[model samples]
Target: SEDELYRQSLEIISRYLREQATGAKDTKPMGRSGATSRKALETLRRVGDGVQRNHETAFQGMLRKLDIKNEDDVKSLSRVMIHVFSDGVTNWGRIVTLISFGAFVAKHLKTINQESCIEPLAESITDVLVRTKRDWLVKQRGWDGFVEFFH
Candidate 1:
């Protein structure tokens, strides 16, 4: 389904970004190490480019799955992208906050794995996406159609 695929894509992109930020080491390195070196920076840039490409690909795929035309069709149904780019840019702080919260909870809980925090953070992001999509659809389409499309 479109939701499932989109969630998976988000997970992949998020993981890629996290890995790039932390490098491929167990411990987070200090500023400007090999992972933050010019070569690593170039690699991350390429990965970012790939992510943009994949995002468009996923959008087109979603349109196909829904049997919709362009944005016009969606707009005709009253569906609009709200806060579409809100989390796309200038939202690192929110992500960092989530990560820090997760780390804090894990440390205090003791039973929680530090890495386990990523899952909840991912879920939080995915929840936003899903809720936004559902809300747009609801406003555009009727309740019955919204419920149907939601599933």
Candidate 2:
């Protein structure tokens, strides 16, 4: 079910953040990685492929829009995603945008010496997406459907 699939997606993101926050060297594969289900992890790899270029380049415009240069900007992070998610057309590309945006934020947090914020930030992404977009995601057959659509 997409409900479980979504949960697994979040877990994978959390694991990604945890690995980054702990001083583990960044791994390219890690960005496209996860574990709510090993199946779900594979889903992430597929989703990562949904966008051909690096996410930063694809979403650099939105990143500048947030201008996350300080802790205050960091605090409003979740609300920002919520607003962004709700403001757009519902689609898998938009969903990927949201998730990839979170990944960028994780990197920014590290740059600003605020790695501790990663956990709560990931939670907010999960909260916003799952709370508001679960039904839509389920209709798309979770990430499995995402792969098909993007393929």
Candidate 3:
């Protein structure tokens, strides 16, 4: 189960290094801003008032198990939730979306010579890399990655 996802990540990453990776092609409704995007928001809006506590507290979970510090980073991220997530998604999908959107936003922030916005986002992205890289297939490619060593 775990290794497969790692294997998939490697093949995809190899492709990405060449700037040729298009992604999982999961057209699932996520913050791209269009008709489908509209629908997701509508669905959430219809139930927004009754959102429960657990729905709001699952932080430190997901790929997040890998990683939060800057209160501003947490606060600022919600400001662009629409751009980061057009719709609901699983933990893995959410991480990928955040990384990509974080980069996209960073570029814009860079043009303005603003470092504050990307600072914490970059911290988060680094944490994810740190976590995933420690796993099986995605790690150094041997030893603890497969046969087992480096204990």
Candidate 4:
């Protein structure tokens, strides 16, 4: 049942992204990034687990954190996400990577003094993943934050 839902997640995301991206960017594979996220997309294609239970799915919730306010932004964001979904690593690694991408983009915008006012909108697009990170990290690395740095 859970696996079934997980498979559905991909369809839901595809549908959602398609709605957002309609007439905007080409869904066709563009580059490496697109390919990368594609794998992740396929893995999470399932459609159950309350993924569509609200106005915003966990994925959508995380997307808004990016502060997308315009069609252009969404389009570009969509493009990035399609690719990011590939080579996702594993163990929900895609989520962590996606959140990182949002952070990087937002930070880049601010550094460039982008006139888009993108600096104020962000948190981590990995909404679903973030919810699990605290527990995941604590188990993975939080025991001591890695044990060593630069001595």
Candidate 5:
């Protein structure tokens, strides 16, 4: 049942992203300069760190909500979520990682006076995260839980 629900959630979230990417919307451009490619890479690495941390936070939050009290349960649930969500999509992992990393970069964009190449990517990633969170709440609990937590 968990697997089935996770799969359904992933489908809904993925479809939402695809729709957002394609629909008529204002697309922000990445402003990273070629000469400062190394800086860009550094910024991206920072973003990656942010993503890993947030992912852990999210996973832990879910575990608490589900009353997953054991390492085995956490591992099992994680495997299922990864399987249903990632599905061996390399680009998906990259996107998720980048979005996580982008959150940190977004905060310091003005401080460093750097070109803002990460905003659009960050926004898209956040959109996916929100949808994924919604799907999980709906599937794991119910529409009522979803509205309660989100609203």
Candidate 6:
């Protein structure tokens, strides 16, 4: 289920970024999207919850309490997450870690009532992952690999 919803999550994110790069950003909250594969996306929520339950506490402190104060900060920290991935061991699982971390950050934005920052945040994740890992991801069948890896 995590695998399925993670795919839909990735799709929404990818589409959002694709649209954003071509013009002004979308005004819609990242929280709103047509329910493409509800089951798949729902699974992503669980994946995020798994990470939050397991690591959000430890991870939050490491992020300086994730002191995100604005959209710019959200952009900055998403890039920080990029370097985090770049600096770590590269593998399918690490990519999951990265996505789940994005989920965690998405939650943080909501809690701060900075929901408007969600697009910028998701945009940054797409930007870096595409810039850095596009080739690898393509060969790996993109999120299909992700689904298979965790299924």
Clashes of each: 0, 0, 3, 22, 4, 3
List the candidates' TM-scores in order.
0.28, 0.68, 0.29, 0.29, 0.24, 0.69
Q: Write one digit per residue (lDDT tens) for candidate 4, span 65-105.
A: 75665535745675556455532443433443453344344
Tens digits of lDDT, candidate 6, 41-144: 44445564576679867768755666777877876786677778876666766765666666666666666777677666776776666567767777876655
Whole-model lDDT, candidate 6? 0.60
Better of 2 and 4 by lDDT: 2
User: How well is each residue in 1-151 modelled by candidate 2, as lDDT tens digits?
Assistant: 4356555567766755555346463343422323223444445445643542466465667767778776577668778777779877888777766766676677677877878778777777878777887788788776566656755
Give the CA lDDT, 0 to 100, for residue 24 in model 3. Answer: 27
Residue 135 of model 3 has an lDDT of 48
Model 6 bad stretches (over 4 Å) = 1-10, 14-43
* Candidate 1, run of 10 with poorest lDDT: 101-110
Candidate 5 lDDT trough over 10 residues, lowest sum: 29-38
Cα lDDT tens digits for candidate 3, 9-28 = 33332222212112122333
Q: Evaluate all candidate structures by whole-model CA lDDT and list the values in order.
A: 0.37, 0.65, 0.36, 0.38, 0.39, 0.60
| Stretches of candidate 4 exceeding 4 Å from the true structure | 1-74, 86-90, 115-151
Cα error, candidate 6, residue 15 (Å): 9.8
Best by lDDT: 2
Lowest summed-lDDT stretch of 10 residues in model 4?
Answer: 142-151
Candidate 3 wrong stretches, greater than 4 Å: 1-74, 78-87, 124-151
Q: Which ten residues in a row have the lowest lDDT in candidate 6?
A: 16-25
